C-alpha cells in the first residue's frame, strides 16, 4: 500500500518539476559569499527536500531489498552523497570549513539529471574523451620532449640580473643576498626597469644583453614572475612549455628567454610554436571534430459604421503597395542607422540638434507605418507575424522615450536587423545563432551550467584567501582588478580562462592560495571547460553547414624568354635584388662603403629588369602581355623603380611625394611570387576564396556596427582621466573630480595631465578599432578597465563605478567573436572544399612535382610483411639471434628507454656535484647497454638488420650518443665553452625518440604530420615572403618611433634582424596591440615632432597614425588568412590517415 503511494508519488509530472525548482533556487543561494545568519534556516529547508526526494526513490525502488533498484543507476550515487554530507556536517566534521562548502556545490550538479536530455548530452561529451586519449599521450610526449630540450638549453638563464659593480663596505654578492629580502632593498642593488615587478634580465652574448654601464651581469635570485616563470626544473619547464602550446602570454616568455639567451635562440621558439602549438592544437580539433561526426551521423542514420470602417480597409491594404512600401522601408531604415553613426566625444550644439530632428523624422516615418499595418491586417492577423511582433516592440520603445534613461536609448540601434531576409549571408549568421538556443540548446545549456559550477567552486575555495593575502599581490593592499572574491568576479575569471588567458591570473591565485590548489582548479577549468567550448563550436559549425623580317625577330625573342638559363638568370636577380633591401637600416650610415655599392648595384638591377620587360613585349606582344595578371604586377614594379631613377637621374626632383614613391621599393620582393611554383599555388587558393570571404566581411561589419554604435553611446568621451605623468597613476577623485578641476591643478602643478586612451569609443571608426582589440583578446583589458571605471563625459573616472559594463564586453565576445569566427571558419573551409572538387578532387596546396612525391609517402603506410630472415647456421648466431626475436627483448629495451628518460628529468639547476657524477655514470651504462643491444642485433641479423628503417635510426642514434659523449669530453680537456657544451649534450635526446617505435597510436599521428609537410612548406614559403615585404616597410617607416610599450632596445624596427623577430611574434597575433601603441602617438606632448637622432639625417620619432593602423591591421588579417590554411591542410591529411 505504502509502496504504491510512494511509487505513485515517484512518477508524477509535478514531482520532477518540484525537485527541479528547489534546486535552481539553491544555486542563487550559493552565490551569497557571506550569507546572513537567518539564511541558515533556508539552508535547512533545502536539506530536507533533498532527503524527502531521496527517500521516495529509495523506499519504492528498494522494497527493503537492499535498494537494488535505487543504487543500480550511476547518477543516484551523486545524489545519495549530498544529503549525507549535510547530515555528516551536522555530525562531527572535518576541520576545513571552506573545503566543506565545496562539497555542497554538487547539489547544483543534480540539475543535470532533473532537466530533460541533459543526461544524454553529458554522456556524449564523455564519449568524446575516449577518442581524445591517444592525442593526449602524444601531447604529453611532445610537451615532454620539448621540456627536456628547453631545460638542457635554458636552465638557469632566467636568473640573470644586472648587479652593481662597486660595493660599499667590502660586501660580496653572496654576503648581500642573505641580508636583504625587502622589495625596496632588492632594488638598490639590481637595476629594476622603472616600476616593473622584477629586475631586468641581462645577457652574456653580444646578441642579447645589455646592462647599463656601471652594472655587471651575474646570475642570482628568483626567476621573474614570482619564480613561477623559470626553466630550472622539469616540472617548471613543463609548465612553461604548456603555456607556449596553448599560447597564453607566450609573447612574454619568448621576450624573456631571448633577452637572456640571446636572439639566436629565437629558432627554438619558431620550431616549438610552429610544430608544437599550431600543429598539436590542430590535431585535437580534428579528432574532436572527426569523433563528433561519427556519433552525430550514426545516431541520425538510425532514425532514417462597421461597413464604412471596412471601406478604408480596401485602401490601406491597397496602399501598403508591398512592392514599394516594404522595400522602401528597408532602404529608409539603413539610412536612419547611418544617421545614428554620426557621433563624437565633442559635438557642437547645432550638430546635436540635427540629430534630434533627423531622429524624429525617422521616428515619424516608422510610426505612421506601424499603425498602417495593423489596420490592414487587423490585430490578430497583424500581431501573429513574427517580424511584426518584433517591430511593434521597436516602435513602442521609441515612443516611450519620445519625450522622456540613457541606457534605454542605447537599444535603438537594434532595428538595423530587418535587412536579414534579403541577404543570403545575413541568413547564415542568424541560422548559426538560432542553433545555439534551438536544436543545440541542450548542449549550450551545459556550457552555462559548467561555467556556473566553476565560478562558485573557485569562489568557495579561494574567496577568503584573496581578501586576507592581498598584500601578496599589491602595494595599496587593495583587491586586484581580477580576483575571486565575489560571484560576479569569480565568474569573470572563469570567463577569461575560457578565452586563452589563464596564466596571468593563475600566478596570482598561487601567491594567495598556494600552488597545489590553484594549479588543480585552473587546469581542470581549462581542460574541461575548453572541451565543451570546442564541442559547441564544432557541433554548431557542422550542423549549420549541412619582307616581314619583323616576324623572325619576334620568334627569336620568344626563344630567349622561354629558355631556361634566362628564366633561371632572372630568378637569381630577383633574390639578389630583394636581398639588397635588407642592408638598409639605421646602421647603414656606419659601413659607408656598402652603402655606395648598394646604391650603384640597384641601377644595374633597374636596367636588367627594364631590359627584360622589353623582351617580354616583343615575345608576347601587347595583347598577350596585358591580359596577364602577373605581368601587370611586374610592370607596375619596374615603373615605380623607373620613375625614381629618372627623377633621381633627371635631378632637381626630390621633394615630397617623390620620396614617398621610393618607399614602394619594399614591394620589390613581390616579383618573386610568380617565379616559385610553391608560392604561386598558395596564391591561386586565396584568389579563389576572396569573393566568398568578401560577403562575410560585410556581415561582420553590419554586426559589428551595431556593437560599435552601441558602444559609442555608452562610453564616448568618458575615457579621459587626470593622471600623474611621472608614474601614470590616476588621481583619487576625492580631489580633481572633474576636468575643470584637473586644469586648476596643472596651473599650480607641473606634471598632471588630462588624457585620453588612444584606442577608444570616441567615434564609430575608433569604436571599430577598440572592438577589434577586444575581439582578438589582445590589449582588450586596458579598455575594459576604462569602461567600468567611467562615470560621465567631463568627470574623472571613479573606480569600478560601472562594474556591470563588463556585461557589454562579455556579450560582444560571445556574439562578436565566438559566432562570427564560427561563421568565418565555416565559409572559408567550405569554399576550400568546393575548390578541391573542381580540380578533379586533388589537393590544392601542392605543385605537380610535389604530388608525385606525396604518393610515394603514401606507400609507406602499407604493412605487407618483409622477409623474416634466416636463423644463421651457427649456434651462437642461433643463440644470439634467438634472444633478439623474442617478444621480451623489445619490451625490455623499451622499458629501458623509459628508465633513461626519467634520468634526464631529475636534472635541475643547482644540483650538487655528487648528483652530477651519478647521472653521468648512470648514462654511460645506458650508453653501453644501448650500444650493446645494437651489436647483438647485428651479430644475429647481419645484412638483414640494415633492411629495416627503424634499425637504421636506432643505429644512428648510438653513433651520435657516443660521439656526443667523446666530444663533450674532448671539449673539457682543451676548451671552455659553456654554450657549446649544452648543445653537444643535446645529442642524447635522440634516444628518447626511440620510444616512438613502441607506441603504434602515436606513430600514426606523427606519420600524418609527415604527409602534410609538402603542403605546409608551400604555405610557409608564401608566409615568409609576406613577412619579408612587411619587415622592409617596417624598417623604413617605424624606426625612430619613440620607445614605449612593446618597442624597446631589441624587439624594435631599427634593423632587419630585429624587424623579423617582431613580425614573427605578431604572426600569432599576440601582443599586436602593444607594437601599435607607440606608432599611434603624434604631436606634443605624446612625442617630439623634431628630434636630432644622432648619427642620422631624419628628424622626428612620431608614428603615422593612419599608416601605422593600416599596416598592423592588414598584417593581422593576412596572417590569419594563411593560418586558416594550415588549419585546413592539417585536417585534410588527418582525415585520410585516420581513415585508412
Amino acid at each position: 500500500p505504502l509502496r504504491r503511494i510512494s511509487i505513485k508519488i515517484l512518477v508524477h509530472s509535478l514531482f520532477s518539476m518540484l525537485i527541479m525548482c528547489t534546486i535552481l533556487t539553491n544555486c542563487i543561494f550559493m552565490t551569497m559569499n557571506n550569507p546572513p545568519d537567518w539564511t541558515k534556516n533556508v539552508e535547512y529547508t533545502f536539506t530536507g527536500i533533498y532527503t524527502f526526494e531521496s527517500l521516495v526513490k529509495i523506499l519504492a525502488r528498494g522494497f527493503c531489498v537492499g535498494e537494488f533498484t535505487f543504487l543500480r543507476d550511476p547518477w543516484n550515487w551523486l545524489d545519495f552523497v549530498v544529503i549525507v554530507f549535510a547530515y555528516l556536517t551536522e555530525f562531527v566534521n572535518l576541520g576545513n570549513v571552506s573545503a566543506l562548502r565545496t562539497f555542497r556545490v554538487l547539489r547544483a550538479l543534480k540539475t543535470i539529471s532533473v532537466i530533460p536530455g541533459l543526461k544524454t548530452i553529458v554522456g556524449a561529451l564523455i564519449q568524446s574523451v575516449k577518442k581524445l586519449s591517444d592525442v593526449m599521450i602524444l601531447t604529453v610526449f611532445c610537451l615532454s620532449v620539448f621540456a627536456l630540450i628547453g631545460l638542457q638549453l635554458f636552465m638557469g638563464n632566467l636568473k640573470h640580473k644586472c648587479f652593481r659593480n662597486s660595493l660599499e663596505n667590502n660586501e660580496t654578492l653572496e654576503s648581500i643576498m642573505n641580508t636583504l629580502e625587502s622589495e625596496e632593498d632588492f632594488r638598490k642593488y639590481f637595476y629594476y626597469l622603472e616600476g616593473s615587478k622584477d629586475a631586468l634580465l641581462c645577457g652574456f652574448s653580444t646578441d642579447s644583453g645589455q646592462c647599463p654601464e656601471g652594472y655587471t651581469c651575474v646570475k642570482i635570485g628568483r626567476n621573474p614572475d614570482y619564480g613561477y616563470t623559470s626553466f630550472d626544473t622539469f616540472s617548471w619547464a613543463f609548465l612553461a612549455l604548456f603555456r607556449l602550446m596553448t599560447q597564453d602570454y607566450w609573447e612574454n616568455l619568448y621576450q624573456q628567454t631571448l633577452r637572456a639567451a640571446g636572439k639566436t635562440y629565437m629558432i627554438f621558439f619558431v620550431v616549438v610554436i610552429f610544430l608544437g602549438s599550431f600543429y598539436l592544437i590542430n590535431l585535437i580539433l580534428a579528432v574532436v571534430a572527426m569523433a563528433y561526426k561519427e556519433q552525430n551521423q550514426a545516431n541520425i542514420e538510425e532514425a532514417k459604421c462597421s461597413p464604412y470602417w471596412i471601406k478604408f480597409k480596401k485602401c490601406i491594404y491597397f496602399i501598403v503597395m508591398d512592392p514599394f512600401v516594404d522595400l522602401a522601408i528597408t532602404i529608409c531604415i539603413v539610412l536612419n542607422t547611418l544617421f545614428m553613426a554620426m557621433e563624437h566625444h565633442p559635438m557642437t550644439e547645432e550638430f546635436k540638434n540635427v540629430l534630434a530632428i533627423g531622429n524624429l523624422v525617422f521616428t515619424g516615418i516608422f510610426a505612421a507605418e506601424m499603425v498602417l499595418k495593423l489596420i490592414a491586417m487587423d490585430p490578430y492577423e497583424y500581431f501573429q507575424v513574427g517580424w511584426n511582433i518584433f517591430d511593434s516592440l521597436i516602435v513602442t520603445l521609441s515612443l516611450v522615450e519620445l519625450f522622456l534613461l540613457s541606457v534605454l536609448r542605447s537599444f535603438r540601434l537594434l532595428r538595423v536587423f530587418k535587412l536579414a531576409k534579403s541577404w543570403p549571408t545575413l541568413n547564415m549568421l542568424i541560422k548559426i545563432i538560432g542553433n545555439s538556443v534551438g536544436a543545440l540548446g541542450n548542449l549550450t545549456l551545459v556550457l552555462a551550467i559548467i561555467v556556473f559550477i566553476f565560478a562558485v567552486v573557485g569562489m568557495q575555495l579561494f574567496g577568503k584567501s584573496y581578501k586576507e593575502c592581498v598584500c601578496k599581490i599589491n602595494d595599496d593592499c587593495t583587491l586586484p582588478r581580477w580576483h575571486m572574491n565575489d560571484f560576479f568576479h569569480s565568474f569573470l575569471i572563469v570567463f577569461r580562462v575560457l578565452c586563452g588567458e589563464w596564466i596571468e591570473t593563475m600566478w596570482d591565485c598561487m601567491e594567495v592560495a598556494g600552488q597545489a590548489m590553484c594549479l588543480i582548479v585552473y587546469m581542470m577549468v581549462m581542460v574541461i571547460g575548453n572541451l565543451v567550448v570546442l564541442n559547441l563550436f564544432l557541433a554548431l559549425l557542422l550542423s549549420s553547414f549541412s619582307g616581314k623580317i619583323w616576324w623572325n625577330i619576334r620568334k627569336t625573342c620568344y626563344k630567349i624568354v622561354e629558355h631556361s638559363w634566362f628564366e633561371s638568370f632572372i630568378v637569381l636577380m630577383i633574390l639578389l635584388s630583394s636581398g639588397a633591401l635588407a642592408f638598409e637600416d639605421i646602421y647603414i650610415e656606419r659601413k659607408k662603403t656598402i652603402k655606395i655599392i648598394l646604391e650603384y648595384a640597384d641601377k644595374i638591377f633597374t636596367y636588367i629588369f627594364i631590359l627584360e620587360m622589353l623582351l617580354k613585349w616583343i615575345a608576347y606582344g601587347y595583347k598577350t602581355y596585358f591580359t596577364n595578371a602577373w605581368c601587370w604586377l611586374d610592370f607596375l614594379i619596374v615603373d615605380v623603380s623607373l620613375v625614381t631613377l629618372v627623377a633621381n637621374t633627371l635631378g632637381y626632383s626630390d621633394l615630397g611625394p617623390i620620396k614617398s614613391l621610393r618607399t614602394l621599393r619594399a614591394l620589390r620582393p613581390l616579383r618573386a611570387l610568380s617565379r616559385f611554383e610553391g608560392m604561386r599555388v598558395v596564391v591561386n587558393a586565396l584568389i579563389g576564396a576572396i569573393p566568398s570571404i568578401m560577403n562575410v566581411l560585410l556581415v561582420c561589419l553590419i554586426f559589428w556596427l551595431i556593437f560599435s554604435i552601441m558602444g559609442v553611446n555608452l562610453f564616448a568621451g568618458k575615457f579621459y582621466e587626470c593622471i600623474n605623468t611621472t608614474d601614470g597613476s590616476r588621481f583619487p577623485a576625492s580631489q580633481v573630480p572633474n576636468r575643470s578641476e584637473c586644469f586648476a591643478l596643472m596651473n599650480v602643478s607641473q606634471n598632471v595631465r588630462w588624457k585620453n586612451l588612444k584606442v577608444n569609443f570616441d567615434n564609430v571608426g575608433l569604436g571599430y578599432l577598440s572592438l577589434l582589440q577586444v575581439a582578438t583578446f589582445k590589449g582588450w583589458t586596458i579598455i575594459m578597465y576604462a569602461a567600468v571605471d567611467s562615470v560621465n563625459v567631463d568627470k574623472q573616472p571613479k573606480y569600478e563605478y560601472s562594474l556591470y559594463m563588463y556585461i557589454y564586453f562579455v556579450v560582444f565576445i560571445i556574439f562578436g567573436s565566438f559566432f562570427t569566427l564560427n561563421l568565418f571558419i565555416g565559409v572559408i573551409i567550405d569554399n576550400f572544399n568546393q575548390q578541391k572538387k573542381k580540380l578533379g578532387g586533388q589537393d590544392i596546396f601542392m605543385t605537380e612535382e610535389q604530388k608525385k612525391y606525396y604518393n610515394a609517402m603514401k606507400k609507406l603506410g602499407s604493412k605487407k610483411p618483409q622477409k623474416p630472415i634466416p636463423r644463421p647456421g651457427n649456434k651462437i648466431q642461433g643463440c644470439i639471434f634467438d634472444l633478439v626475436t623474442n617478444q621480451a627483448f623489445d619490451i625490455s629495451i623499451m622499458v629501458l628507454i623509459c628508465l633513461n628518460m626519467v634520468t634526464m628529468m631529475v636534472e635541475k639547476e643547482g644540483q650538487s656535484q655528487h648528483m652530477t657524477e651519478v647521472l653521468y655514470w648512470i648514462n654511460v651504462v645506458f650508453i653501453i647497454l644501448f650500444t650493446g643491444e645494437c651489436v647483438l642485433k647485428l651479430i644475429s641479423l647481419r645484412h638483414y638488420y640494415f633492411t629495416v628503417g627503424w634499425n637504421i635510426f636506432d643505429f644512428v642514434v648510438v653513433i651520435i650518443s657516443i660521439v656526443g659523449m667523446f666530444l663533450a669530453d674532448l671539449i673539457e680537456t682543451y676548451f671552455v665553452s659553456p654554450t657549446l657544451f649544452r648543445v653537444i649534450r643535446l645529442a642524447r635526446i635522440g634516444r628518447i625518440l626511440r620510444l616512438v617505435k613502441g607506441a603504434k597510436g602515436i606513430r600514426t599521428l606523427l606519420f600524418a604530420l609527415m604527409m602534410s609537410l609538402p603542403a605546409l612548406f608551400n604555405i610557409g614559403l608564401l608566409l615568409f615572403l609576406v613577412m619579408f615585404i612587411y619587415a622592409i616597410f617596417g624598417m623604413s617607416n617605424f624606426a625612430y618611433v619613440k620607445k614605449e610599450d612593446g618597442i624597446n632596445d631589441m624587439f624594435n624596427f631599427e634593423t632587419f634582424g630585429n624587424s623579423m623577430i617582431c613580425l614573427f611574434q605578431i604572426t600569432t597575433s599576440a601582443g599586436w596591440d602593444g607594437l601599435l601603441a607607440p606608432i599611434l602617438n603624434s604631436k606634443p606632448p605624446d612625442c617630439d615632432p623634431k628630434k636630432v637622432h644622432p648619427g642620422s639625417s631624419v628628424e622626428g620619432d612620431c608614428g603615422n597614425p593612419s599608416v601605422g593602423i593600416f599596416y598592423f591591421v592588414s598584417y593581422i588579417i593576412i596572417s590569419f588568412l594563411v593560418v586558416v590554411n594550415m588549419y585546413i591542410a592539417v585536417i585534410l591529411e588527418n582525415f585520410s590517415v585516420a581513415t585508412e
Partner: protein, 120 residues
C-alpha cells in the same frame, strides 16, 4: 583568530628541560623588522603577565630573575616557529606561558597559551 599551535597543557618533570612548542601560521613571508614575537609568564590565571623574551629585529632575552638564565629561544621563526626552552625546570615555573605574534603585513595578532605543570 590567528592560527597558533601550542599544547594547552604541558606536563614536565622537575629538573628536566621543557620545550614550549607553539606553531604560528600566517600567509606571506616573514620580515625581520616586520616580524615581532613576545613571550610572557604568569604564576596563575589572574596573575599579572611578565614578559620574559621578545623578538624585535633579533631575540631579546629579558633575563627575568624568576627564571635565572634558564630561558632560551628554541625556534626558527621563519619556519612559523617561535618555541622557547626552559632548562632544568623548577616547581616555581608552573603557570601560564603566553606567545603573542604580530606579523606585518598581517594585521591580526596570534596568541598561544600553555599551562605548564611541574611533576614531582
Amino acid at each position: 583568530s590567528m592560527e597558533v599551535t601550542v599544547p594547552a597543557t604541558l606536563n614536565v618533570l622537575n629538573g628536566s628541560d621543557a620545550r614550549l612548542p607553539c606553531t604560528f601560521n600566517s600567509c606571506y613571508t616573514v620580515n625581520h623588522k616586520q616580524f615581532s614575537l613576545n613571550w610572557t609568564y604568569q604564576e596563575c590565571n589572574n596573575c599579572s603577565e611578565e614578559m620574559f623574551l621578545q623578538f624585535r629585529m633579533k631575540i631579546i632575552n629579558l633575563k627575568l630573575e624568576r627564571f635565572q638564565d634558564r630561558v632560551e629561544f628554541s625556534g626558527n621563526p621563519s619556519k612559523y616557529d617561535v618555541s622557547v626552552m626552559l632548562r632544568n625546570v623548577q616547581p616555581e615555573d608552573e603557570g601560564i606561558y603566553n606567545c603573542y605574534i604580530m606579523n606585518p603585513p598581517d594585521r591580526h595578532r596570534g596568541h598561544g597559551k600553555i599551562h605548564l605543570q611541574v611533576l614531582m
